[PDB]
Design a protein around this ligand. Structure first.
Ligand SMILES: *[C@@H]1O[C@H](CO)[C@@H](O)[C@H](O)[C@H]1NC(C)=O
Lengths: 50, 49
């Protein structure tokens, strides 16, 4: 997530793992998903769990 | 107080529907822009695009 002047940028990517360890090796570039034109300041963020 | 609004009253007493369009800026960058018309494009020719 990025908080540029007037577009909250969002990037996403999905890759398999097939193993049980720390973050795997190799590069995986995330692609832009939505611009979300908003002018609201953002300094704190939280995670939504179910 | 309530109006009469009968179809027999003159123009000075007839009801009118008014729509006001207020424009704002400096809040969000370019959220409501006007109609951007376009033209049919061609190829294999030197044309401005
Ligand atoms: C948001 O950030 C802008 C740019 O730094 C600043 O001018 C403005 O006062 C900030 N607003 C709030 C509510 O923090």
């Amino acid at each position: 997530f990025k908080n540029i002047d007037g577009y909250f940028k969002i990037y996403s990517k999905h890759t398999p793992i097939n193993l049980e360890r720390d973050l795997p090796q190799g590069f995986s570039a995330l692609e832009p998903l939505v611009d979300l034109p908003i002018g609201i300041n953002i300094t704190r963020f939280q995670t939504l769990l179910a | 107080q309530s109006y009469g609004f009968r179809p027999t009253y003159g123009v000075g007493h007839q009801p009118y529907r008014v729509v006001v369009l207020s424009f704002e800026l400096l809040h969000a960058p370019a959220t409501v822009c006007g109609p951007k018309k376009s033209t049919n494009l061609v190829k294999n020719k030197c044309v401005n695009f």
